[PDB]
Design a protein around this ligand. Structure first.
Ligand SMILES: NC(=O)c1ccc[n+]([C@@H]2O[C@H](COP(=O)([O-])OP(=O)(O)OC[C@H]3O[C@@H](n4cnc5c(N)ncnc54)[C@H](O)[C@@H]3O)[C@@H](O)[C@H]2O)c1
Ligand SMILES: NC(=O)c1ccc[n+]([C@@H]2O[C@H](COP(=O)([O-])OP(=O)(O)OC[C@H]3O[C@@H](n4cnc5c(N)ncnc54)[C@H](O)[C@@H]3O)[C@@H](O)[C@H]2O)c1
Lengths: 297, 297
């Protein structure tokens, strides 16, 4: 228990050092994204906002989508200070009709998107019996169904030119699960499944030019969940996540975990017995605001 | 290419007789389901139909749901020949309003469901750009969102009595992916995520009496997909799947793969490099009717 803690800390330290060593010994080649038309959904705040900043520094043409007009204009203002050409659109990324109508505007005013970042997301932390049905559907409408509509609208051009990049922002909740997040984990598993099946179908059809990347961070300090706490995982800073994402996109990395040492916990979750996984679970002590038993705890 | 077939044939034969050895050395205790109120969705045909037959032989009280009244009555007729008490209801298991209204009828006419089998499902095989948006939503409405509505309606009683069993019929498509099945794989990943997060939340809340099982089969000969063909996996007969499901429920098995040796391919998909996975993929030669490039291939 105390020694399990130290074991997990030493493995975390070994992974961190060894990965940093491989990044100097065998570095992956970075591609250029200058001049690419990058569409980022949920770009009005958090991961989407700081990912837009990274693409502005990379010299890409930006198309930012969000339901929050004020936020998306604040992001665009900063991207323009970084020297980027930005187009903002107020779009509900859970509404199919809104998505298709807005893609028509993007083609007319900007052109054909070459990099798509499906970042927009929502969460309503509560135990299954404290969830509202409307909140469950909204979670799927934004976290996964929106990915289908945007990808179907933007893929035709990418296939024609044999050139594109589809980034799916999922979560470690798309590989592992957390209590009081059943609809969220369910929708994030669907996002991982979509990325994996889209990657394979493109391979099967012989489409060599369209790359895919899946972003899977642990808790990030954006306010997405109120006051998160994990003993074994870090509460990430937004800029760190955006930096890891841009590094992964530029090197065509398919599955980007943040921090990369989450892979150790991923392997433990597949081979460890139930008793061992419950011991790690208690040590983790996950905390965050949620509605438990119809009361916000 | 050549030795690769017998390399996988060996890992299949070895698993088959090591599992049979563990079933004698460390046997799992089978529980009784006699007198339990078992609700099976999609019980009008295939896996749901033959699972109803297995529960009829187990002496449970059956509640069968399906959109096909003729088919669900044909299943009930056979369960009654097996000596079981069966109640049939025509329910759209993708329609939330229909689900809640029907749960009110089940409580009034039958009582409180203790075993829930979420089996109803749908598939529209096509490449992403040949899919219809209506087909994508229908896949999620039945394959995952219906699980949320039925489980939320039936869980309160199970928690009050600290006694229940939630069975999620997912697929190997909820762990691995197959091209031309992006919405299907995505919705099956969401079903696996729901089972895993439901299992953890019940554990976290101290609910010791509610068990969870997840049925993940390879292709089953039900007509669900047209003329399926797999070289390394068998095309399972429906009765085999129903037998494996009943054996897993009676021993409280959380993840039931059919055949159980799919676990070898599951581990190969996590540790083998891209080159080796594409070599096994070609050897697999998965075939089934699907709309490819707006043409039925
Ligand atoms: N924050 C975390 O702890 C965390 C961890 C893992 C994964 N993620 C994922 O990262 C993504 C971004 O989360 P974040 O932490 O940056 O959140 P955030 O709250 O900082 O920002 C999310 C943004 O998405 C926008 N958005 C919400 N619904 C939308 C809709 N219907 N249409 C358009 N835009 C919409 C919001 O307006 C907001 O600007 C999400 O997909 C989330 O699930 C977050
Ligand atoms: N057959 C396979 O190859 C296969 C493989 C893996 C997983 N599965 C899964 O097993 C489950 C059952 O498949 P099957 O092969 O037995 O199919 P099937 O087509 O033989 O039977 C499915 C049944 O579900 C019913 N159903 C469909 N939509 C419904 C709805 N809205 N409400 C109520 N009932 C509904 C149908 O009327 C039918 O009786 C599905 O979830 C499927 O995804 C099947």
């Amino acid at each position: 228990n105390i020694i399990l803690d130290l074991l997990l800390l030493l493995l975390t330290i070994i992974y961190s050092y060894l990965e940093a060593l491989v990044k100097v010994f065998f570095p992956r080649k970075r591609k250029s994204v200058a001049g690419e038309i990058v569409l980022i959904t949920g770009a009005g705040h958090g991961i989407g906002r700081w990912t837009a900043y990274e693409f502005a520094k990379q010299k890409s043409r930006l198309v930012l989508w969000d339901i929050n007009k004020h936020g998306v204009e604040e992001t665009a203002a900063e991207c323009r200070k970084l020297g980027a050409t930005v187009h903002t659109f107020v779009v509900d990324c859970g509404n199919r009709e809104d998505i298709y109508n807005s893609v028509k505007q993007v083609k007319k005013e900007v052109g054909d998107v070459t990099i798509l970042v499906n970042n927009a997301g929502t969460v309503y932390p509560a135990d299954l019996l404290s969830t509202k049905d409307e909140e469950i559907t909204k979670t799927f409408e934004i976290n996964i169904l929106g990915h289908f509509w945007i990808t179907k609208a933007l893929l035709p051009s990418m296939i024609k030119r044999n050139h594109g990049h589809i980034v799916t922002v999922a979560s470690v909740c798309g590989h592992g699960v957390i209590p009081y997040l059943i609809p969220y984990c369910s929708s994030k598993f669907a996002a991982v499944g979509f990325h994996r099946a889209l990657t394979l179908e493109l391979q099967t059809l012989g489409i060599t030019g369209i790359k895919t990347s899946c972003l899977c961070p642990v808790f990030v300090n954006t306010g997405f969940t109120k006051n998160p706490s994990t003993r074994l995982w870090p509460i990430l800073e937004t800029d760190t996540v955006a930096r890891s994402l841009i590094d992964g996109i530029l090197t065509n990395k398919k599955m980007i975990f943040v921090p990369s040492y989450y892979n150790i916990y991923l392997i433990l979750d597949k081979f460890l017995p139930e008793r061992a996984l419950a011991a790690i679970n208690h040590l983790q002590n996950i905390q965050f605001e949620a509605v438990i038993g119809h009361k916000t705890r």
